[PDB]
């Protein structure tokens, strides 16, 4: 009923708008009521709130021009820097496609700055890569020295400045003043200062605060932050040890186990990533990350029925996407559940909300067509994958294969060149171009293409045979 | 595969393509004759049996069903 | 040998197919007829709107955007894919939002496309939006005389990241 | 009645003649909740800009 | 009898696909297609006062009729990006005769249809106007010795001293006869009230006054005694005259065979086993199948 | 049906209503003594509705009284001095009212009536936000209630008598309030993320027994006491789930990756553990023994309050209530329905219509293989040129642009005509001159 009471109830219920508006009203009506002020702050900052553990974002500057790793040639297995590319598709040369996109996945690192600007903006990130990673209250006006004396206002105002205004400098100033006031004996302000430092790029001054907070109160968030720091310094084994210490404190925490699995899967050790994802399953059994990762892995290691079980589980728990339904249609067609494939593909096409998702669904429908044995429907599906996303190297490769099957060698050559220019990390257009070049002579381009094939997927046997043939011809 | 899918006219036309295409394998003729017999036809089943015997080749099971359809026609 | 292991799911599903294979077969044939219908539909629509960057008159075009600032190098890779015949009369037009983007030369002619060679044709797009606002940019390759685009390409221009 | 007799030998390759490789079917990765919310927020900003 | 708001029927006769007397058509759209049935059959969707009717527009034999007192979840899916226009879809989720049905209606023409908004608006009006067409006990009908009127309602008469021949202590009440319902509320404990709408009344007579209600939604025998028999018969006359004048055109207050198997919301399941108590979880859980267990169903 | 909240007696509860936590209650308010439960629901309008579901129908609603002012909290307990019978306490912003739901029968099941008789009322000189109740101290056969004003003040009423009121120290917004009996302590979650436990005697005498800096602020706090083996204070933070010991430290904690709305630790099944029940803003219920997820099921609505009660000869029925009005009893669905396309025979493929369309489209396909005049006039005199462009249909998104040469320059380069109606004429005029 009353203004403040109803604003509180709205905020509790995650309205975040009715309480904000009613707070504007109650503030204009009575210029002296700080409860409504901090409540409007909370509503504002929680409309936009995002988990800081998951906000790991890396720009080109932080990839190339920010050096913080101690070693330079660490032993293989002690730094972050399965199905072969002949089975599991790849996003870059290494790091085949995953089952779960978090906003911190890397899937490689661009070498130079030229290598990074001249590459599709979502090749090493889960969002377009950057160069670096009226109003409510005016930040310059309010004096943090006054708010930091009272923590009830201090914590909410800090959350507002750090998560809404995104001004890490004023946030760190308020956090420093507030930690001064509280005589350095509350873990929360330590963790907030650590987050501010980690944003500013000072990973050791942030590790210091996370460590000083763990000594005060062992909480899941501090372990996740500290492992995030230890991974920013490129020390995966320190992070694994910290995670295991956390799991010693919290005997079954799913976030720690999933962090361990993410590390083991970024070190490209799927044998332990899958074991820790299986532990997460033994704990959660609705975990989207664990189920998607084990499901993809099962699909690609000659077990589409088990992957179908896992994705059907994701569908039972109320997930309704374009990716989920594409995956379901694929696992159905390959598990030989021919009665549930094409309806899942149509549902996926319905749910698609991009032009890359539509292109991927038409690409997979073209694969279903190729399997069914009709190259005309396959032709149309690959061409529609191109219509929906012109930079779809796989559609070009498969369409060129079908063309070369028809007899159109020049069409196939141009399409394979476009593909191998769009995705240089893909061995298939390189190998195809080299093969149909050697078939017609032109051993120069045949060799130039076999070399890039072997650069993309080196243990490929046919590429080795072709390279040896061409090197014999050269001598 | 179509005969066991409750779809026998497509089985007919598929067998028609098969017998027009195949020259030196009587198993196609034997299977078409068995389809015709089990369809109660039994008149062109002898035509299929004759096409088969014009092509003779003995699998261990290709003989028994052959001679059983034979004594039946 | 690394012959895979088949769990109970495989045997249960081959059992359900052994009992009820005819329903699966009929429903798959129905869904495949519907799929051919929808694919022919979408393909006819793309032919109608000239949305395909690959479709006599043998040509191919894709576009690349390079740059992260308020200025992007939009390079069009255009290729004549034929045994031996050049393509004389071609032009490229850009359809863009004249508020968000500033292209100096929208319309320009295309050189004699020697068969088998990739021609990269550069342009400089400039994000004019003072905020971060992206938009699509279409590229029509078409003969001079005719008025129906021989083909089209689409480019989702990335965010400005400028000022 | 008579069951349909079937061939038993099957078809075997005698040589590995080179062929053309197709790319492989792609399982689309599932987006996290935080990634979904970031995309939602940026799309909503673009939208509330477009309406003017 | 009225069934177009209470049931979800398939392959309806062209006489029942037509506007029931009290019904009014609200909106329509052509080229709507039926998904959750993968026949690819184009059709035509129609939103009426009481239900949504889809029919094939080429073979109108195959069609669907979904009532508003059966729909639980009506959602709109705006998707299908630039490849064509935004082919908006509609998702209806219903529970009829204890079975969950799901219908997907895809507007093939790429434009966004205004029908999907009128649908939800009229459904909201339907749900919010159930005091017109349903039986209610002990509800909130009286503000202060005075009835609370519906949107389309006029109170015709108000009789006093009306006893209730269903209790023994809280009896002396008041009787409001209206153009949409007859209500009785006690003098003391004004929370003891009954409201019977003419749609539910089947027969009014004297036996000392007896209302017999429709057995299709609960057959109650409500008896009220009035002191002067003259006023008794007068009220009987008024009530029956109002019932007949209402029956010719019902108000409804809305302000503004094996094919059904294909429309299962659950999927290959149409009945829930009996809910028992699970000692493992400590909650009520539906009876487990023979072989299955809770920890064997929870694991992946 | 697997992993769905299978429905039971359910009903929507008004016309654009508004409910919160503390509205939904579930107890034997009628004092039947049998053991069933009756669903009580207050509203932010005044509609105190009490139901006894019998699976909807019309016998379910015991009563639907409408009080003038909104109903913030509803509770059921021994709120009257002498009798040991459960009563119904209703809390509005500035009023506390304890009723007595007495039902008297009629000869027929639809002739029995129920009345709520006001057993007493207290005026509140402050605007309340919520309240809790218990045996303050060690008094037996009593449930005296503490009401938290929205400006941080615990006003304790021993039934029928305003006992006292103490200002909570250092609080701006109001938080969730709970009462522990194993420690005789009020427990709050203040605005500075501090879970604070005060002793009741220290409050009555007036400070803080203990504190714990959890990382956020709490929606609900449930001190569950069905088990006496070890008391534990459960806390639902706005991001994390906590179970705390009686001394103050964390017994365990889980980091939810979702936004919780309501939680309820119901009875436990194993030895030492406690089954708990948390609802998402993704309208999904999670059953967690300790921190291990034992089950998860999709709710119809985002619950604002969940309870688990025995309703009409069935134990452990889940009773959810939203803020729209969706009130629903439910059980958990444990049928792993087969994944198979339906074997319908009526629904077949209309091959004729579909084949006409397919032949049409295939015709366009096999055919693909085998209206605006622009005129420029240059004046004979920086010479001024004028371009006249005309149509014959209703063209749209028209753009005209002029390209002369590098040295030559134009004063106007682009002209945008959004729509021009049919057989109409547009005329632009620019001027070209040498620059260089």
Numbering used by the authors:
A (entry chain 8): 1 to 81, 90 to 141, 158 to 499
B (entry chain 4): 347 to 402, 408 to 424
C (entry chain 1): 425 to 479, 483 to 590
D (entry chain 0): 7 to 58
E (entry chain 5): 6 to 212, 219 to 267, 296 to 339
F (entry chain 9): 2 to 56, 63 to 213, 234 to 397, 410 to 420, 439 to 493
Extract from the study:
In the absence of ARL6, the eight subunits of the BBSome are arranged in two lobes that we call the head and the body (referred to as the top and base lobes by Chou and colleagues [Chou et al., 2019]). The head is formed by an asymmetric heterodimer of BBS2 and BBS7, with the other six subunits forming the body. The head and body are connected by a helical neck formed from two abutting coiled coils, one from BBS2 and the other from BBS9. BBS1βprop occupies a special position in the BBSome, cradled loosely between BBS7 in the head and BBS4 in the body. Relative to the body, the head is more flexible and less well resolved, while BBS1βprop shows additional flexibility independent of the head movement. Within the body, BBS9 interacts with all other subunits of the BBSome. A crystal structure has shown that ARL6:GTP interacts with blades 1 and 7 of the BBS1βprop. However, this binding site is occluded in the BBSome structure, as blade 7 of BBS1 forms a continuous eight-stranded β-sheet with the corresponding blade of the adjacent BBS2βprop. BBS2βprop is unique among the BBSome β-propeller domains, as contains two Dx[D/N]xDG-like calcium-binding loops; the first in blade 4 and the second in blade 6. A calcium cation can be seen bound to both loops, coordinated by a network of acidic sidechains and the mainchain of the conserved glycine.
